[PDB]
Design a binder for this molecule. Structure first.
Ligand SMILES: Cc1cnc2c(C(N)=O)cnn2c1
Length: 352
């Protein structure tokens, strides 16, 4: 029963990541029936089967098949994943929007099952602090960045400048800044180290998903996932506006604490797009996809950190007239193209 000697901000981060209740709330927010399907009953092969049904809906809508088939698959989805809408009609998976919503839901369900499997596995010893046991389950070095260092100065300027005016529901306060080093990730990222056009970008996600993000990195949606459920196909999505990525933390007024990622991304040749392009492979010679947004952080204020460009400029007009994106988007389709550097802990102070 040796109390953990880890830094207090790290211990708080471990407790917040490995909280079983936060997993249960996240499933309740999706209106999943926890009585007919509790958290311990979540299965990876069950989520993959739900991914396949979403893919069956995608192909039926395209091939002009029976919309009656699209009704049977919708009811199949709700039998596979038991929900509880009370007295309301469940949303019908009959169009592309419904597929994207349930695709995003299964991405968080797959990460929740990963966090719970990580928690209830391995070995156990009641002589060690549970905080110490969970920290080594992540297989990640986690150090607190000093508040007065130039790293924290640049990171704060990154959060300070790239908060979009459209995302007016809140403003962000940086609580903690962690310098993370995933086990073995640096060797995996080595072939992309001297690739040109490397940037430090944001990645937001649910807090419960970070037990798997630190354990296995940022993954691509499984093969069973429908490629049309994501705007630019099955890849890893990043942004340069801190508010665009913080929206994917799914932070509520009840739980206003968020976790966001700062990662070095080997972009290389950017396939610049303006609208949806559901692809799994890039054209030969390209290494990433950039969704051109109307507003881009000023390129004149670009600075470097460890040889990595940091687009912390104020948002100005990009010079792109016809685009379906308000802000930029960076997508890679190889997991080795990501090197996670920092992990931030943000307080969401919702306004107006
Ligand atoms: C479809 C999609 C998913 N995730 C993201 C992020 C992020 N997680 O930071 C930014 N844009 N984006 C887009």
């Amino acid at each position: 029963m040796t109390k953990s000697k880890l830094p207090k901000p790290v211990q708080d981060l471990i407790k917040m990541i490995f909280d079983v209740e936060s997993m249960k709330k996240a499933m309740v927010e999706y209106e999943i029936d926890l009585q007919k399907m509790p958290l311990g009953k979540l299965s990876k092969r069950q989520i993959q089967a739900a991914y396949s049904i979403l893919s069956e809906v995608q192909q039926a809508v395209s091939q002009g098949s029976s919309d009656s088939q699209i009704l049977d698959l919708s009811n199949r989805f709700y039998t596979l994943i038991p929900h509880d809408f009370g007295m309301k009609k469940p949303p019908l998976l009959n169009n592309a929007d419904s597929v994207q919503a349930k695709a995003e839901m299964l991405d968080n369900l797959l990460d929740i099952e990963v966090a719970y499997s990580l928690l209830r596995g391995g070995s156990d010893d009641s002589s060690k602090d549970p905080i110490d046991v969970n920290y080594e389950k992540l297989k990640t070095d986690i150090k607190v960045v000093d508040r007065d260092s130039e790293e924290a100065e640049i990171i704060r300027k990154y959060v300070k400048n790239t908060h979009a005016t459209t995302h007016n529901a809140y403003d962000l306060e940086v609580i903690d800044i962690f310098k993370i080093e995933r086990e073995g990730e640096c060797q995996r990222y080595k072939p992309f180290k001297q690739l040109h056009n490397r940037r430090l970008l944001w990645h937001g996600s649910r807090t419960t998903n970070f037990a798997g993000i630190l354990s296995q990195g940022l993954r691509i949606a499984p093969p069973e996932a429908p490629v049309t459920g994501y705007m630019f196909g099955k890849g890893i999505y990043f942004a340069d506006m801190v508010s665009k990525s913080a929206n994917y933390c799914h932070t509520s007024q009840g739980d206003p604490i968020g976790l966001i990622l700062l990662g070095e991304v080997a972009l290389g040749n950017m396939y610049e797009l303006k609208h949806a392009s559901h692809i799994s492979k890039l054209p030969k010679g390209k290494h990433s996809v950039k969704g051109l947004g109307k507003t881009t952080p000023d390129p004149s204020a670009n600075i470097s950190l460890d040889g990595v460009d940091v687009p912390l400029g104020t948002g100005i007009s990009s010079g792109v007239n016809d685009t379906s994106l308000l802000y930029n988007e960076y997508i890679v389709y190889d997991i080795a193209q990501v090197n996670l550097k920092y992990l931030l802990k943000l307080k969401f102070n919702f306004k107006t």
